[PDB]
Design a protein around this ligand. Structure first.
Ligand SMILES: Nc1ncnc2c1ncn2[C@@H]1O[C@H](C[C@@H](N)CC[C@H](N)C(=O)O)[C@@H](O)[C@H]1O
Ligand SMILES: Nc1ncnc2c1ncn2[C@@H]1O[C@H](C[C@@H](N)CC[C@H](N)C(=O)O)[C@@H](O)[C@H]1O
Lengths: 420, 412
């Protein structure tokens, strides 16, 4: 109704027939499919997000969840499909106070082949929701980025890291989701200064960081000392403190692709996981948000670099930020790499109670706490009882929500329809 | 009852383009439902071409000049690049060796309903497809574009030239110290979108040049010469946007044109194409930075390169800004018998050639007039000869009538 008024009349006669479909009628799903056909702009065939029967709730792994200091910020790690986690994350925030996250950072699978190899699907080709190649990859992030928006604060930021293989298409896609007026920058990251051998006989040296602000977000200025030590090539040559406006280019020794990977290898004692972001890159991004107690989210958490980064910044910043992570355990990367890295960083002993990894020999343990959650799926038929309601309340209670005045609802269980 | 036939068709085929749920929504919810959706941009109807008018070039003999028959011959066209491109396609079709090795353009960024008729992106769609027609198999096209509009152009050039041929999206750090626009942030970079037709491989860069011009980027021979593969980052002292603006004002002794690109940037790009004798095209020529760069690269490289420029007289720029630049650089003296501007006190004149053409419009039914049809027919032949075409073919009336129907200007 309102969306059609905004679109106006490029093809109005067809709209009159579309308006007839509303009268005949689970409507918004059909409207989105229609609008794509008639739309005048960037277009692709969206696939309808058909809510499966099952429902998704958080179950806390009490053995894996640890807590070293009650005074340190409380942090969260959700293990499972990020589509189900985000549905649960939104329900938690609604029933909660101080709603939504101050910062969002994600490193989604760049390539269409990379997504299939070790991630979501539905095995010879990449197919998502009956769609192949780019349409799949686009459909994927559209529905996740829609939710991510719902979770972002009015004065919040969302950072996204992309390759050249989907960057332009994601910036157009994110323009639709977050609004083209809120596009802040498309910052280049020279993470491979030496240049990687590329099929087209060129030395691809760079990467992007799409920044989209909430409607009234103003980026924070960088501290002189941080900018001189960390980004010496970009900042060189008088009220309050000495600060720098963020320059839309990221390049420096700390911000190498090899740095982030070597760190992980040193903590994990394993080079199995080969794609990690520089911890310093993410510190710089979250530094752009003025609240140094910001709530950071990263539903493509991978090796937990976001978590380690927040912790490092807190040590240097002097403020207490909490992070929420989500990552599926495809080949255990979620269970093995995220937990191991975060555990070893926090306590200095391996899960096998062995302390031989190089990192702890070099630096001291952070001594923070991490809550681990799983995704348990219950049947829609059994929904359409007492066990579901019971666990939902535990989830809310798990996140420090006063549950004396909250009850299970059909509206809320409808919100948590899982993905097939 | 028509439902039964529609239901049968739905049940008959499904396949990739339809999701089982999509089929369920098509039957649960007809030409609109059966319409196919392509991944990319949908555009409003563009401005119709004038069926009752044609455009032709007409050399300005007073303005065009020649200094050295051994140096390459270059071209400057004044007017709407859409009408200019339509002629250039007719010129190449009748030319012995067809089409350009290098296209560089820096279009304007620009409420504008993109995808609309006069929308910034629609007009670029129309002109880019023609430039696609004007590019050789083993050629390149460079477009400079800003932080915000870079993505829409990239997916467009994906449609027009194909994503298979996307080479790089180079960040050019052309404002080392940022400038705040649209938001509280120091915007420091631009993008260069590199596309090439099949059979094009970028040339490696000379160590000596790479070291002086880009020392920050090419930090520390099996073959014959020292070569660096092109890194997708352009940070240099000589790649400043203020640098290109000071050069232009060094020549013109005027600050009237504020958005001049550095010539070192456009040198690095055309220096990316293999052969020294290359044809460069730039149908958004602005102040002619592309022309200055081809000549300067020729002085450094030793190869003879010809450029073709096109720019309109929006604010008289193409006459005052673009021509004066090219003129004062070739001739070593202002056009009005003066010689006191800075550039020529610091560097030698190139002493090269340049031809200036205007775009003239002649209403149809002037063919009905006997004296006008001949005038148009001779002006068409004069074009070809001005661009070094033999003209033995297409002298007849049939061939001329086929190429004149191809040159129709835009609606105004
Ligand atoms: N549908 C999905 N649901 C949950 N996790 C996913 C999904 N798709 C990909 N992932 C994970 O998200 C992470 C994406 C990574 N590229 C992120 C890298 C991360 N920035 C790091 O420093 O390690 C990987 O661990 C993937 O296995
Ligand atoms: N339809 C058009 N036809 C010809 N020129 C145009 C047209 N639209 C814009 N322009 C010109 O294209 C140029 C685009 C400039 N931004 C390019 C600047 C140029 N690259 C320089 O370094 O000086 C401007 O001079 C515009 O006046």
């Amino acid at each position: 109704a309102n969306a059609l008024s905004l679109s106006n009349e490029l093809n109005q006669d067809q709209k009159d027939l579309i308006l007839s479909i509303i009268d005949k009628f689970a409507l918004h799903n059909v409207y989105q499919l229609m609008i794509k056909r008639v739309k005048l702009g960037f277009v692709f065939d969206i696939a309808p997000s058909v809510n499966a029967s099952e429902i998704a709730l958080f179950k806390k792994d009490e053995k894996l969840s640890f807590n070293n200091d009650n005074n340190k910020p409380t942090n969260t790690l959700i293990i499972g499909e990020n589509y189900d986690a985000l549905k649960n994350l939104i329900v938690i925030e609604s029933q909660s106070e101080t709603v939504n996250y101050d910062v969002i950072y994600i490193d989604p699978p760049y390539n269409t082949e990379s997504s299939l190899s070790d991630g979501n699907n539905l095995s010879s080709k990449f197919i998502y929701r009956g769609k192949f190649s780019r349409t799949g990859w686009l459909n994927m992030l559209n529905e996740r980025l829609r939710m991510a928006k719902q979770l972002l604060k009015e004065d919040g930021v969302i950072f996204v890291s992309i390759d050249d293989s989907e960057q332009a298409y994601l910036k157009v896609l994110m323009d639709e989701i977050f609004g083209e007026e809120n596009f802040i920058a498309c910052v280049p990251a020279i993470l491979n200064p030496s240049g990687r051998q590329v099929n087209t006989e060129i030395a691809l040296t760079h990467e992007y960081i799409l920044i989209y602000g909430g409607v009234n977000f103003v980026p924070e200025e960088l501290d002189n000392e941080y900018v001189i030590n960390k980004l010496p090539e970009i900042y060189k040559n008088k009220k309050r403190k000495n600060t720098w406006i963020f320059k839309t280019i990221i390049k420096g020794s700390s911000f190498n692709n090899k740095t982030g990977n070597k760190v992980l290898s040193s903590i994990l004692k394993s080079d199995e996981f080969s794609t990690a972001k520089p911890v310093e890159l993410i510190k710089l991004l979250i530094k752009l948000h003025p609240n140094n107690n910001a709530r950071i989210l990263d539903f493509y958490a991978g090796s937990g670099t976001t978590g380690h980064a927040v912790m490092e910044l807190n040590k240097e910043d002097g403020g207490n930020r909490c992070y929420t992570l989500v990552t599926n355990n495809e080949n255990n990367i979620a269970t093995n790499v995220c937990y191991e890295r975060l555990y070893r960083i926090n306590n200095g002993i391996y899960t096998n109670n062995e302390s031989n990894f190089d990192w702890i020999k070099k630096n001291k343990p952070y001594k923070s706490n991490l809550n681990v959650y799983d995704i348990e799926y219950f049947s829609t038929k059994l929904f359409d009882n007492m066990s579901i309601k019971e666990q939902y309340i535990k989830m809310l209670q798990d996140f420090n929500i006063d549950t004396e005045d909250k009850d299970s609802n059909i509206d809320i269980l409808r919100s948590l329809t899982s993905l097939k």
